[PDB]
């Protein structure tokens, strides 16, 4: 008998681990600024910043706010390690 909560009405997880880890560490929550760049065109529909959360090692598409370039990077590299746009760092 464990009680669950659906994050963003899609992902059902245990309430304990959800309140402790999942909820506070969602990409649209922890880093909304980074969530802004989320490439909504080239990036599968079943993945969006309201779910993937920081710490996602798989690379995802990012649309840059400055040079409007689309680059592929991991969410953990983008948020934790401080990843950036290759064209912007070149400029």
């Amino acid at each position: 008998k464990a009680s669950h909560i659906r994050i963003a009405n899609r992902k059902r997880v245990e309430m304990f681990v959800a309140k402790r880890f999942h909820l506070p560490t969602r990409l649209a929550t922890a880093a909304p600024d980074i969530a802004a760049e989320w490439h909504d065109e080239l990036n599968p529909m079943h993945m969006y910043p309201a779910i993937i959360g920081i710490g996602h090692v798989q690379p995802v598409w990012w649309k840059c706010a400055i040079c409007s370039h689309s680059y592929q990077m991991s969410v953990e590299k983008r948020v934790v390690r401080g990843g950036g746009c290759p064209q912007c760092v070149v400029n």
């Binding site: 963003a8 009405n9 899609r10 059902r12 529909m45 079943h46 969006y48």
Partner: protein, 159 residues
């Protein structure tokens, strides 16, 4: 394994809906599985309004019924894809297809007295009947019916 799904999707543009269903089908195919059939089921108004990912209640929803063959592991993979999808407000999974409901719980003598292939081979519409479908339609299909139905609209036709 014969699996069936009922998807309740928010009625977005046709291009967005096609993109969602195409992604689902591509997951099915890249996961080494087959789709027995897909059927758009129209746009209806559910009795309880599902909230979008934006937490807005949606009065209308399009229904899609999928029938497919997949192993259990990759079926779970695509199942999580469908559940966590953006559009899918709900996804009802039919586990009852190979074995008819009630015999696992019903009667001990009858638990091993069924033929799984009978239900496995036929489609979901033949296991779960709609209100309109009835054995009369199957008898009509078994009949040629071409020279039988030709005289149907005469009495009303002349008047």
């Amino acid at each position: 394994v014969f699996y069936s799904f009922v998807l309740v999707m928010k009625p977005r543009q046709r291009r967005f809906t096609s993109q969602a269903l195409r992604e689902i089908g591509v997951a099915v195919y890249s996961n080494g599985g087959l789709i027995r059939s897909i059927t758009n089921e129209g746009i209806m108004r559910p009795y309880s309004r599902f909230r979008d990912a934006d937490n807005t209640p949606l009065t209308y929803a399009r229904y899609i019924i999928l029938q497919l063959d997949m192993g259990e592991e990759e079926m779970g993979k695509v199942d999580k894809i469908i559940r966590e999808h953006q559009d899918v407000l709900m996804a009802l999974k039919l586990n009852n297809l190979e074995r008819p409901v009630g015999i696992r719980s019903g009667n001990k003598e009858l638990q091993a007295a069924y033929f799984p292939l009978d239900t496995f081979t036929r489609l979901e519409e033949e296991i779960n009947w709609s209100p309109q479908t009835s054995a009369d339609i199957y008898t009509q299909l078994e009949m040629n019916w071409k020279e039988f139905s030709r005289t149907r609209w005469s009495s009303f036709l002349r008047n």
